[PDB]
Amino acid sequence: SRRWFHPNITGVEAENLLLTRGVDGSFLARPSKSNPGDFTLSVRRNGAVTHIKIQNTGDYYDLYGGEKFATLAELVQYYMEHIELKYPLNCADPTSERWFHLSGKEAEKLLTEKGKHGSFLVRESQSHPGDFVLSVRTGDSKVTHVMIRCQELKYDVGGGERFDSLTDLVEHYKKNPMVETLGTVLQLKQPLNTTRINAAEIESRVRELSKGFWEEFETLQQQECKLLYSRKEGQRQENKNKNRYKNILPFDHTRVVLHDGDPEPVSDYINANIIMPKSYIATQGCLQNTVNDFWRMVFQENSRVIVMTTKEVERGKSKCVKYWPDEYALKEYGVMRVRNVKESAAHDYTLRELKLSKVGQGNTERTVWQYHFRTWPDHGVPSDPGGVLDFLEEVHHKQESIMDAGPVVVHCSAGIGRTGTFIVIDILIDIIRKGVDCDIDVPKTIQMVRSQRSGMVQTEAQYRFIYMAVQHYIETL
Ligand SMILES: CC1(CN)CCN(c2cnc(Sc3cccc(Cl)c3Cl)c(N)n2)CC1
Numbered sequence: 001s002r003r004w005f006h007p008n009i010t011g012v013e014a015e016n017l018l019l020t021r022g023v024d025g026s027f028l029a030r031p032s033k034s035n036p037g038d039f040t041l042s043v044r045r046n047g048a049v050t051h052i053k054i055q056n057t058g059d060y061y062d063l064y065g066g067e068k069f070a071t072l073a074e075l076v077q078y079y080m081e082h083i084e085l086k087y088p089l090n091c092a093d094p095t096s097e098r099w100f101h102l103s104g105k106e107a108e109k110l111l112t113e114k115g116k117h118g119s120f121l122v123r124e125s126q127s128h129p130g131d132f133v134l135s136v137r138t139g140d141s142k143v144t145h146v147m148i149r150c151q152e153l154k155y156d157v158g159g160g161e162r163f164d165s166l167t168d169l170v171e172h173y174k175k176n177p178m179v180e181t182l183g184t185v186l187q188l189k190q191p192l193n194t195t196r197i198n199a200a201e202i203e204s205r206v207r208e209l210s211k212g213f214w215e216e217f218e219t220l221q222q223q224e225c226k227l228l229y230s231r232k233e234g235q236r237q238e239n240k241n242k243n244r245y246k247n248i249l250p251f252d253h254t255r256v257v258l259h260d261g262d263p264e265p266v267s268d269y270i271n272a273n274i275i276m277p278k279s280y281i282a283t284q285g286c287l288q289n290t291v292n293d294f295w296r297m298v299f300q301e302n303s304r305v306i307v308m309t310t311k312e313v314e315r316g317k318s319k320c321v322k323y324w325p326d327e328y329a330l331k332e333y334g335v336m337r338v339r340n341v342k343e344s345a346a347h348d349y350t351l352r353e354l355k356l357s358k359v360g361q362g363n364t365e366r367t368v369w370q371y372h373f374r375t376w377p378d379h380g381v382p383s384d385p386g387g388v389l390d391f392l393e394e395v396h397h398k399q400e401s402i403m404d405a406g407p408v409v410v411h412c413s414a415g416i417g418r419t420g421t422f423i424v425i426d427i428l429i430d431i432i433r434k435g436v437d438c439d440i441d442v443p444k445t446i447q448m449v450r451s452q453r454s455g456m457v458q459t460e461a462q463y464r465f466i467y468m469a470v471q472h473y474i475e476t477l
Pocket residue numbers: 094095096097098099100101193194195215216217218219220221223441443444445447448
């Protein structure tokens with residue numbers, strides 16, 4: 001449902017809402033206004049409201065007194081199946097729906113300039129403030145307007161059932177479409193796309209979102225509820241301690257499956273996923289016990305470029321074990337043998353030239369290049385995207401320069417926040433690098449990658465950093 005999230009309520013607004021429209025076991029989650037980036041889980045117990053903080057600095061949602069998760073949905077899912085969270089107290093604000101917005105004539109052109117059969121949107125009435133309008137497109141070539149009146153806190157389209165919110169109303173006429181007198185069926189097949197822009201417009205769009213970014217991002221967040229794909233392998237007993245974060249797991253359907261492993265019972269698991277929009281494996285920072293597994297992956301998938309986006313230690317916290325030999329040194333990691341051939345240090349990153357081979361057979365050698373980005377801020381995102389961009393641009397040419405190279409391995413700590421910011425920037429400039437004659441749809445791209453790994457861009461700050469990055473790249477054409 002994900003409608004248990006309320007984008008714009010204060011604490012007290014939530015408390016009274018739980019205590020007036022809810023029962024013991026009712027809960028909700030809301031953006032925290034004390035700390036931008038944080039969120040708050042609000043639950044009713046014994047007729048009282050306890051509030052639970054959840055911090056997300058860019059790596060994961062850290063529920064205090066609980067566990068760390070990829071999305072708030074997987075969080076709620078996790079706790080609704082094991083202070084009890086029984087009944088979602090659902091939100092009626094539509095600000096975070098894909099279809100909500102806006103003048104009629106302006107609505108008609110967009111539907112004409114960008115819509116197909118079934119594209120629709122809901123806007124606020126201009127004739128009677130308080131009422132709403134549902135504008136829908138039908139064709140093979142017509143746009144239809146359906147007024148939605150607000151009466152005594154309930155909404156309708158002039159007859160039939162009265163709804164407690166537009167989302168309910170809309171959801172009802174998606175499954176039960178209005179039929180006009182001459183046969184025309186007003187099918188609400190897809191919300192109108194207003195986020196895909198031409199690459200040359202990014203600068204215009206970024207300026208108007210800065211007076212916007214919040215709304216669009218959380219409108220993308222609200223859609224994570226569609227991405228609760230199974231992650232069972234990662235919960236299997238033999239795999240629990242192969243995860244750096246027990247509750248941040250790879251989708252079974254996109255995980256990398258290690259083959260040709262030791263006869264041990266389970267030898268095919270690693271907290272990684274293939275990311276296909278050049279392809280990527282998105283993974284977590286190695287642990288002591290999965291280093292040999294990490295290199296089995298690199299070998300198997302023919303990866304020749306690794307991109308690590310964290311220090312080994314950050315703020316005294318460990319984030320990734322040292323899985324590469326010292327410069328000029330040679331190490332054996334299970335059946336895999338790695339020599340660090342040379343290291344080169346730039347200001348923002350280090351390149352390690354690593355040769356990977358399988359012990360015993362000197363016909364499996366391949367160079368692997370590890371690009372170790374070292375200047376990401378301990379919290380937040382870089383104030384400027386130049387460093388990231390030149391990094392990725394270097395990374396891309398290295399990858400393009402090797403024949404038959406496999407996925408490009410990308411990893412941070414939990415492998416969702418930073419790792420996902422990078423891959424996405426990389427996909428988008430991949431497009432712009434086609435030139436400036438191309439459309440860019442950041443939300444779409446983020447959602448396509450979250451469908452392949454949980455939580456793949458973590459924060460709003462990062463989300464805007466992606467826009468800044470693409471803008472900057474376009475400026476430098
Ligand atoms: C005004 C608005 C209020 N709610 C409504 C429209 N805007 C909007 C719409 N859709 C999404 S999401 C998405 C986008 C493309 C492809 C896919 Cl697949 C997804 Cl899932 C988004 N982030 N913003 C911005 C805010």
